[PDB]
Amino acid sequence: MASKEIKPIENSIVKEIIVKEGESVRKGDVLLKLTALGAEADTLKTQSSLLQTRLEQTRYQILSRSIELNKLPELKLPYFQNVSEEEVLRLTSLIKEQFSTWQNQKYQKELNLDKKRAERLTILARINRYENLSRVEKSRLDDFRSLLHKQAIAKHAVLEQENKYVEAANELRVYKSQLEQIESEILSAKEEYQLVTQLFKNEILDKLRQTTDNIELLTLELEKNEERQQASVIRAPVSGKVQQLKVHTEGGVVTTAETLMVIVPED
Amino acid sequence: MASKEIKPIENSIVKEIIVKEGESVRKGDVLLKLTALGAEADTLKTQSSLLQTRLEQTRYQILSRSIELNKLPELKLVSEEEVLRLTSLIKEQFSTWQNQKYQKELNLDKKRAERLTILARINRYENLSRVEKSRLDDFRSLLHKQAIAKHAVLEQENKYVEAANELRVYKSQLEQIESEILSAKEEYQLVTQLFKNEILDKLRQTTDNIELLTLELEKNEERQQASVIRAPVSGKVQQLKVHTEGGVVTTAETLMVIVPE
């Protein structure tokens, strides 16, 4: 009577061989335990990916807090027990570069803003000065005109004084328009200053969202990987004696093409 | 017996001759009426003085009003070349005053401009000092966490203290310029203060002098009244100077003679 060949339905790793050579088994008995080839590998890869993603999450949470503090919090990891510390110092160092870059951007936006405010101060000074000047020369002009109602001064001086007044007035006009322009520019500068931290915070909580989502996905994936690395049993399809048992393939690879053992019917 | 000469006791003007040639007169009778020459002279001169004092009085009165108006009134009240001298002098005084006010005011305005500059610098370095202070804090906390050069941190210190000291200096400057501005203000006030004081000092004096010259004019007018020469003895009037009415006679000259009868 024909011997029945026992072959894996997929490429596998022999975990445990239960039967022995020559042993009689009945249909349904356990012969050996197998795991899918690559399952363990996949699990480890998902674990490592998960670890990295958690690290980067931690980085962006610490940055997120650094924005609200406007200072760096304690740079420590909060699972992480055997994380290489040079990984930790690389991470903290990235945190430091990002934070310092942010504060520098804020600082130079602030410098620009302050220079604009200085411009405004100068312009305002000029405006007030020419307000006073226009006033005194206007009153002096009126005086001179009354002096030419009563023939007490030359017309020449009167019209030169007019010229003075009109001069001062025009100057005043010019500086006022300038003030309008500079005021507008100052509001713009303010908006840029806000824009720095606006963008930075956006980036930070977008990468926080991304790290959390990816962690969840990798968690589902990790569940799948962990379940798939679980051992399956090959049972005896018929009753009989176990022969040609590959007794030393435990921990070794067997493909779907290869015969693990054969079962020879006894009756 | 000798004939008696009739001569004035001072230089005089014969106003009216009462007696006639050959007329018999008694001791005490009126011969003529005369006025002192210097009496009339004095009267004319006090009149002219009074006129002048009134002119300058009006001048300082209208100037006095011109101060409160800050403008020339009228200018109307006598020789018109006097009127033009007076009006033009008024104009020089007033214009001089307004010019003085004008340049005290220019000075004051330059002081105010300086103050503006100082305030601008003060505010700019207030902002700057704040910004560099915040950067300093940032750096110090950055090396609480070992993220920056110590070099950079204390160089930042240097920046901040620089700005702060600058601010100090500029503040002291502001105080000085403020004091100077108050000084300038007081000078500006002082111009019109002095001008008004002198003007109603000359008003006081011109009014007082007007009153004095008025009393004096009364005295002179009374003194300008005609006196009578009476006959010192009785007799006949001879050698009567019929042609001295309205004319001046000296102490040396004989008005007439009286021959005893």
Side-chain angles (χ1 to χ4, degrees):
Chain A
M1 283 166 88
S3 324
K4 326 298 181 196
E5 299 186 3
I6 308 301
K7 292 172 176 176
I9 64 182
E10 62 179 302
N11 299 339
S12 311
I13 299 178
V14 177
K15 289 299 179 178
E16 181 180 21
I17 300 178
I18 293 201
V19 291
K20 300 201 158 199
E21 178 81 18
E23 172 174 359
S24 288
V25 297
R26 257 269 162 191
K27 171 189 194 183
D29 287 348
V30 185
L31 305 168
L32 46 74
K33 292 174 179 163
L34 249 43
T35 54
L37 189 65
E40 161 185 348
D42 289 339
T43 292
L44 301 177
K45 299 323 173 213
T46 290
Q47 286 180 323
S48 93
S49 299
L50 194 65
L51 180 65
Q52 295 301 317
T53 308
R54 281 216 173 83
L55 287 181
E56 177 181 286
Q57 161 163 301
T58 274
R59 164 170 77 157
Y60 283 107
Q61 286 181 355
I62 289 182
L63 281 173
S64 178
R65 258 278 286 183
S66 75
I67 286 183
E68 327 177 332
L69 291 191
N70 195 43
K71 61 198 314 172
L72 282 159
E74 185 179 54
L75 308 173
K76 90 171 194 183
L77 298 177
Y79 180 84
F80 301 92
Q81 292 87 1
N82 299 98
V83 169
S84 38
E85 277 53 16
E86 161 282 315
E87 251 173 311
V88 178
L89 284 54
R90 222 55 173 174
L91 166 138
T92 54
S93 171
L94 292 174
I95 292 167
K96 296 177 179 171
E97 321 174 332
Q98 266 158 327
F99 183 82
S100 75
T101 290
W102 173 56
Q103 297 211 302
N104 288 340
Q105 289 170 348
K106 285 195 308 175
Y107 173 75
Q108 210 95 12
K109 289 308 192 185
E110 189 150 16
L111 281 189
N112 178 252
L113 185 63
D114 162 54
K115 146 209 175 193
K116 294 293 176 56
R117 285 195 180 111
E119 296 184 38
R120 175 170 67 189
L121 286 174
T122 294
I123 292 178
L124 285 168
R126 289 279 185 165
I127 291 175
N128 189 271
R129 154 155 175 225
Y130 287 125
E131 277 178 351
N132 295 341
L133 186 53
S134 66
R135 176 223 100 77
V136 294
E137 301 294 351
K138 171 62 187 175
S139 303
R140 173 80 147 177
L141 174 67
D142 300 339
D143 288 352
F144 280 9
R145 288 180 175 173
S146 73
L147 270 64
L148 216 71
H149 184 47
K150 305 192 131 60
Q151 309 201 7
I153 200 166
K155 200 175 178 173
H156 183 240
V158 173
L159 275 182
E160 171 186 334
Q161 184 60 34
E162 199 169 355
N163 289 337
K164 269 192 179 188
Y165 162 68
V166 182
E167 276 167 23
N170 293 335
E171 204 78 6
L172 172 59
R173 214 163 205 85
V174 173
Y175 283 98
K176 285 186 170 186
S177 66
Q178 295 302 99
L179 176 60
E180 298 297 325
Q181 180 61 35
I182 262 60
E183 217 68 56
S184 190
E185 294 180 23
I186 284 180
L187 291 195
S188 292
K190 286 199 175 192
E191 198 36 40
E192 297 177 23
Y193 179 84
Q194 292 293 121
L195 181 60
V196 168
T197 292
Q198 211 165 113
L199 289 189
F200 187 52
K201 151 164 182 181
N202 287 334
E203 147 183 3
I204 282 188
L205 62 92
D206 191 337
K207 230 85 188 75
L208 271 188
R209 182 162 188 292
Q210 275 175 321
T211 51
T212 55
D213 289 344
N214 286 349
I215 281 175
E216 198 240 350
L217 290 186
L218 291 182
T219 287
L220 297 189
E221 183 67 14
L222 174 63
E223 290 175 357
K224 295 181 181 184
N225 293 160
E226 285 179 324
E227 283 131 346
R228 178 169 178 251
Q229 71 188 347
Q230 237 177 344
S232 296
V233 291
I234 291 192
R235 298 185 180 277
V238 300
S239 318
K241 272 183 190 305
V242 172
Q243 231 71 43
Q244 305 179 25
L245 181 57
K246 303 198 159 181
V247 300
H248 268 336
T249 54
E250 301 202 358
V253 177
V254 291
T255 64
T256 178
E258 293 167 320
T259 290
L260 288 160
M261 77 194 73
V262 77
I263 299 176
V264 290
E266 299 158 308
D267 82 274
Chain B
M1 164 163 39
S3 58
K4 328 298 181 196
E5 298 187 3
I6 311 301
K7 292 172 292 181
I9 65 181
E10 61 180 302
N11 298 338
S12 311
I13 301 178
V14 177
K15 292 300 178 178
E16 181 180 21
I17 301 178
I18 290 89
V19 292
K20 298 278 155 16
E21 179 81 18
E23 172 174 359
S24 288
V25 296
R26 260 272 159 188
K27 171 190 195 182
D29 287 348
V30 184
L31 305 169
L32 48 76
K33 294 173 180 162
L34 57 74
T35 57
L37 188 64
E40 302 193 344
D42 290 338
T43 292
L44 303 122
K45 304 328 168 220
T46 48
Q47 286 179 323
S48 93
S49 299
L50 193 65
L51 180 65
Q52 298 303 317
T53 307
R54 280 216 172 83
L55 286 180
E56 231 181 39
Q57 162 163 301
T58 55
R59 162 172 144 212
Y60 283 109
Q61 297 181 297
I62 58 199
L63 280 174
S64 177
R65 201 216 171 181
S66 75
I67 286 182
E68 327 177 333
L69 290 190
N70 196 43
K71 267 193 179 29
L72 270 22
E74 324 201 286
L75 307 82
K76 300 291 184 292
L77 298 176
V78 194
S79 166
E80 293 183 13
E81 66 182 297
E82 285 175 309
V83 178
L84 267 48
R85 263 212 37 199
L86 167 137
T87 54
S88 276
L89 178 56
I90 291 165
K91 294 177 179 173
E92 307 177 52
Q93 267 159 327
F94 183 81
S95 74
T96 291
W97 174 57
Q98 296 211 301
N99 287 340
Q100 288 171 348
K101 285 195 308 175
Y102 175 76
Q103 270 233 308
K104 287 308 192 185
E105 189 150 16
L106 281 189
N107 177 37
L108 184 63
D109 162 42
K110 288 169 188 172
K111 292 292 176 181
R112 285 195 180 111
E114 295 184 38
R115 175 171 67 189
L116 286 174
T117 296
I118 293 178
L119 285 168
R121 289 201 248 108
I122 290 175
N123 189 271
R124 155 153 177 73
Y125 280 81
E126 277 178 351
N127 296 342
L128 187 53
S129 182
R130 179 54 196 149
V131 171
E132 300 293 351
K133 171 63 187 307
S134 302
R135 171 136 274 226
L136 176 68
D137 300 339
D138 286 352
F139 281 9
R140 289 179 175 173
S141 73
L142 272 188
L143 220 66
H144 184 265
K145 307 285 184 175
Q146 311 202 8
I148 195 67
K150 206 196 186 169
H151 185 44
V153 174
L154 275 69
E155 167 264 341
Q156 185 59 34
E157 203 177 348
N158 289 337
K159 269 193 178 188
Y160 162 68
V161 294
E162 177 275 331
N165 294 335
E166 203 78 5
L167 173 59
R168 270 163 136 188
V169 172
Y170 290 165
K171 285 186 170 186
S172 66
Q173 295 179 349
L174 175 59
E175 221 59 6
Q176 181 163 325
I177 195 49
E178 288 289 8
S179 77
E180 294 180 24
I181 283 180
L182 291 195
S183 292
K185 286 198 176 192
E186 204 38 39
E187 296 178 23
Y188 179 84
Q189 293 293 286
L190 181 60
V191 168
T192 292
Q193 211 166 113
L194 290 189
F195 186 52
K196 148 163 29 198
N197 286 334
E198 146 178 11
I199 278 189
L200 160 60
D201 191 335
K202 300 290 284 186
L203 272 188
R204 182 169 184 87
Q205 276 176 319
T206 197
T207 55
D208 289 344
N209 286 349
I210 281 304
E211 264 314 294
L212 291 186
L213 291 182
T214 287
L215 296 189
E216 183 66 14
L217 176 63
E218 292 175 354
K219 295 180 180 182
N220 291 15
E221 284 179 323
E222 103 168 331
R223 177 169 53 140
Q224 199 177 17
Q225 284 172 14
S227 296
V228 292
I229 289 193
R230 299 184 181 277
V233 301
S234 318
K236 271 183 190 305
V237 171
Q238 232 71 43
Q239 304 179 25
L240 181 57
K241 303 310 181 58
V242 198
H243 61 78
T244 52
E245 300 202 357
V248 179
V249 290
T250 64
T251 60
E253 296 166 322
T254 50
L255 288 160
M256 76 195 72
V257 77
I258 303 298
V259 289
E261 298 158 307

XYZ file of all heavy atoms in Angstrom, chain B residues 172-215:
363
model
N 19.927 110.680 30.934
C 20.543 111.850 31.567
C 20.488 113.058 30.624
O 20.147 114.191 31.033
C 21.988 111.550 31.971
O 22.802 111.332 30.832
N 20.797 112.798 29.354
C 20.685 113.820 28.318
C 19.286 114.442 28.295
O 19.143 115.673 28.244
C 21.027 113.230 26.951
C 22.472 112.776 26.821
C 22.774 112.166 25.468
O 21.868 111.884 24.685
N 24.055 111.958 25.187
N 18.261 113.591 28.338
C 16.882 114.079 28.358
C 16.634 115.030 29.521
O 16.013 116.086 29.351
C 15.887 112.921 28.435
C 14.427 113.369 28.580
C 14.001 114.239 27.401
C 13.494 112.181 28.739
N 17.112 114.658 30.705
C 16.932 115.539 31.859
C 17.553 116.919 31.617
O 16.896 117.969 31.815
C 17.507 114.896 33.122
C 16.641 115.085 34.372
C 15.222 114.524 34.245
O 14.894 113.865 33.234
O 14.421 114.750 35.177
N 18.809 116.917 31.170
C 19.488 118.183 30.884
C 18.693 119.050 29.899
O 18.447 120.241 30.158
C 20.898 117.936 30.341
C 21.665 119.217 30.038
C 23.158 118.994 29.896
O 23.740 118.150 30.578
N 23.789 119.755 29.010
N 18.279 118.456 28.779
C 17.575 119.232 27.761
C 16.235 119.751 28.295
O 15.783 120.824 27.894
C 17.351 118.432 26.449
C 16.953 119.378 25.314
C 16.298 117.357 26.612
C 17.850 120.587 25.179
N 15.603 119.002 29.198
C 14.356 119.475 29.795
C 14.591 120.744 30.609
O 13.853 121.742 30.469
C 13.724 118.395 30.676
C 13.117 117.227 29.912
C 11.838 117.582 29.166
O 11.467 118.775 29.102
O 11.194 116.651 28.643
N 15.629 120.716 31.446
C 15.977 121.910 32.220
C 16.225 123.101 31.288
O 15.691 124.205 31.501
C 17.207 121.661 33.094
O 18.396 121.694 32.325
N 17.023 122.867 30.248
C 17.330 123.924 29.285
C 16.071 124.479 28.616
O 15.978 125.680 28.342
C 18.305 123.416 28.225
C 19.683 123.076 28.767
C 20.625 122.581 27.689
O 20.396 122.907 26.504
O 21.596 121.871 28.024
N 15.101 123.604 28.363
C 13.849 124.020 27.740
C 13.074 124.941 28.677
O 12.535 125.966 28.240
C 12.976 122.811 27.348
C 13.521 122.163 26.076
C 11.533 123.234 27.123
C 12.726 120.970 25.601
N 13.027 124.594 29.960
C 12.373 125.486 30.920
C 13.063 126.853 30.958
O 12.395 127.900 30.991
C 12.339 124.866 32.318
C 11.409 123.661 32.462
C 11.158 123.346 33.928
C 10.096 123.905 31.730
N 14.396 126.841 30.941
C 15.157 128.092 30.871
C 14.741 128.946 29.670
O 14.456 130.145 29.804
C 16.657 127.802 30.805
O 17.122 127.246 32.022
N 14.707 128.318 28.497
C 14.342 129.007 27.262
C 12.937 129.597 27.347
O 12.698 130.735 26.918
C 14.449 128.060 26.078
N 12.013 128.821 27.910
C 10.649 129.293 28.127
C 10.647 130.568 28.956
O 10.001 131.561 28.594
C 9.806 128.229 28.836
C 9.384 127.055 27.972
C 8.214 126.322 28.609
C 7.699 125.209 27.714
N 6.394 124.675 28.193
N 11.389 130.540 30.060
C 11.430 131.695 30.949
C 12.035 132.917 30.257
O 11.610 134.042 30.516
C 12.197 131.380 32.233
C 11.803 132.272 33.422
C 10.308 132.593 33.489
O 9.476 131.699 33.208
O 9.963 133.751 33.807
N 13.029 132.708 29.394
C 13.593 133.823 28.628
C 12.543 134.434 27.691
O 12.379 135.672 27.621
C 14.815 133.366 27.825
C 15.990 132.902 28.679
C 17.160 132.402 27.850
O 17.268 132.789 26.666
O 17.972 131.616 28.385
N 11.828 133.558 26.984
C 10.754 133.990 26.094
C 9.731 134.840 26.842
O 9.313 135.890 26.353
C 10.064 132.786 25.449
C 8.922 133.156 24.526
C 9.159 133.511 23.203
C 7.606 133.146 24.974
C 8.119 133.848 22.353
C 6.559 133.483 24.132
C 6.822 133.832 22.823
O 5.787 134.166 21.979
N 9.327 134.381 28.024
C 8.415 135.156 28.862
C 9.046 136.490 29.272
O 8.374 137.529 29.334
C 8.023 134.359 30.106
C 7.175 133.132 29.820
C 5.802 133.484 29.288
O 4.936 133.950 30.029
N 5.594 133.262 27.995
N 10.348 136.443 29.542
C 11.090 137.592 30.048
C 11.086 138.751 29.065
O 11.014 139.910 29.476
C 12.530 137.195 30.384
C 13.421 138.305 30.946
C 12.846 138.857 32.242
C 14.842 137.802 31.157
N 11.186 138.444 27.773
C 11.120 139.491 26.747
C 9.905 140.424 26.921
O 10.055 141.635 27.160
C 11.082 138.878 25.332
C 10.709 139.929 24.295
C 12.422 138.249 24.996
N 8.709 139.851 26.823
C 7.469 140.616 26.937
C 7.284 141.167 28.354
O 6.735 142.260 28.539
C 6.244 139.755 26.542
O 6.299 139.463 25.141
C 4.937 140.477 26.848
N 7.771 140.424 29.347
C 7.739 140.896 30.731
C 8.426 142.262 30.860
O 7.817 143.256 31.296
C 8.412 139.874 31.652
C 7.843 139.813 33.060
C 8.296 138.574 33.817
O 9.033 138.667 34.799
N 7.855 137.406 33.361
N 9.691 142.300 30.451
C 10.493 143.517 30.491
C 9.886 144.621 29.638
O 9.785 145.770 30.083
C 11.926 143.235 30.029
C 12.808 142.402 30.958
C 14.247 142.414 30.468
C 12.720 142.914 32.389
N 9.488 144.276 28.415
C 8.924 145.273 27.506
C 7.708 145.970 28.120
O 7.604 147.203 28.096
C 8.549 144.625 26.172
C 8.103 145.606 25.123
C 8.878 146.712 24.812
C 6.916 145.414 24.438
C 8.468 147.613 23.843
C 6.502 146.310 23.469
C 7.279 147.409 23.170
N 6.805 145.180 28.695
C 5.594 145.730 29.296
C 5.919 146.584 30.528
O 5.366 147.695 30.704
C 4.627 144.594 29.648
C 3.759 144.835 30.869
C 2.567 143.879 30.901
C 2.861 142.552 30.208
N 1.606 141.826 29.860
N 6.853 146.088 31.346
C 7.312 146.841 32.515
C 7.816 148.233 32.138
O 7.330 149.249 32.664
C 8.425 146.086 33.248
C 7.914 144.895 34.022
O 6.753 144.845 34.428
N 8.795 143.932 34.255
N 8.765 148.283 31.205
C 9.320 149.563 30.769
C 8.226 150.448 30.162
O 8.194 151.662 30.401
C 10.472 149.371 29.777
C 10.563 150.452 28.713
C 11.745 150.253 27.782
O 12.379 149.177 27.828
O 12.046 151.181 27.001
N 7.325 149.844 29.387
C 6.272 150.633 28.747
C 5.365 151.352 29.752
O 5.062 152.538 29.569
C 5.388 149.768 27.816
C 6.058 149.597 26.452
C 4.023 150.419 27.597
C 5.164 148.944 25.428
N 4.983 150.699 30.845
C 4.068 151.412 31.734
C 4.874 152.114 32.846
O 4.327 152.855 33.681
C 3.004 150.451 32.283
C 2.166 150.698 33.547
C 1.334 151.969 33.409
C 1.245 149.514 33.830
N 6.197 151.999 32.763
C 7.050 152.847 33.580
C 7.128 154.190 32.869
O 7.073 155.253 33.508
C 8.431 152.222 33.764
C 9.270 152.932 34.811
O 9.043 154.137 35.068
O 10.180 152.275 35.369
N 7.185 154.144 31.540
C 7.218 155.374 30.766
C 5.822 155.984 30.724
O 5.670 157.195 30.559
C 7.734 155.117 29.348
C 9.144 154.550 29.279
C 10.189 155.571 29.699
C 10.424 156.598 28.602
N 11.541 157.525 28.940
N 4.802 155.152 30.910
C 3.451 155.671 31.087
C 3.309 156.394 32.425
O 2.743 157.496 32.493
C 2.418 154.552 30.983
C 1.943 154.272 29.556
C 0.774 153.288 29.516
C 1.584 155.571 28.861
N 3.813 155.772 33.489
C 3.801 156.412 34.803
C 4.476 157.782 34.753
O 3.890 158.811 35.146
C 4.510 155.523 35.828
C 4.525 156.073 37.252
C 4.998 155.016 38.243
N 4.941 155.476 39.628
C 3.868 155.390 40.406
N 2.746 154.854 39.945
N 3.922 155.835 41.653
N 5.699 157.792 34.228
C 6.475 159.027 34.148
C 5.825 160.078 33.247
O 5.809 161.264 33.586
C 7.898 158.743 33.673
C 8.832 158.328 34.798
C 10.215 157.965 34.307
O 10.369 157.314 33.274
N 11.235 158.396 35.043
N 5.298 159.657 32.100
C 4.688 160.618 31.189
C 3.440 161.256 31.813
O 3.223 162.461 31.658
C 4.357 159.983 29.810
O 4.135 161.017 28.845
C 3.146 159.069 29.874
N 2.638 160.475 32.539
C 1.453 161.042 33.183
C 1.843 162.017 34.298
O 1.312 163.141 34.379
C 0.533 159.949 33.758
O 1.279 159.116 34.654
C -0.041 159.093 32.637
N 2.786 161.594 35.141
C 3.264 162.452 36.226
C 3.788 163.781 35.685
O 3.425 164.860 36.175
C 4.360 161.747 37.029
C 3.828 160.602 37.863
O 2.598 160.537 38.073
O 4.641 159.765 38.312
N 4.634 163.692 34.665
C 5.199 164.874 34.030
C 4.121 165.759 33.416
O 4.231 166.984 33.450
C 6.223 164.474 32.969
C 7.525 163.987 33.575
O 7.759 164.136 34.775
N 8.383 163.406 32.744
N 3.085 165.142 32.853
C 1.963 165.914 32.327
C 1.316 166.738 33.435
O 1.028 167.928 33.250
C 0.902 165.008 31.672
C 1.355 164.612 30.272
C -0.438 165.724 31.576
C 1.664 165.803 29.401
N 1.123 166.122 34.598
C 0.494 166.836 35.709
C 1.364 167.990 36.213
O 0.876 169.118 36.422
C 0.185 165.872 36.854
C -1.238 165.353 36.822
C -2.242 166.462 36.572
O -2.382 167.348 37.443
O -2.884 166.456 35.500
N 2.654 167.708 36.386
C 3.606 168.731 36.814
C 3.605 169.920 35.857
O 3.480 171.073 36.278
C 5.016 168.148 36.916
C 5.272 167.141 38.036
C 6.750 166.773 38.086
C 4.801 167.692 39.372
N 3.743 169.629 34.568
C 3.754 170.666 33.544
C 2.426 171.418 33.474
O 2.386 172.568 33.038
C 4.089 170.065 32.180
C 5.516 169.546 32.004
C 5.726 169.022 30.591
C 6.529 170.628 32.342
N 1.342 170.770 33.893
C 0.042 171.435 33.935
C -0.009 172.477 35.053
O -0.395 173.636 34.823
C -1.104 170.424 34.124
O -1.299 169.690 32.908
C -2.399 171.140 34.478
N 0.395 172.075 36.257
C 0.477 173.025 37.369
C 1.412 174.187 37.025
O 1.082 175.367 37.232
C 0.945 172.324 38.649
C 0.015 171.242 39.205
C 0.469 170.789 40.585
C -1.425 171.739 39.247
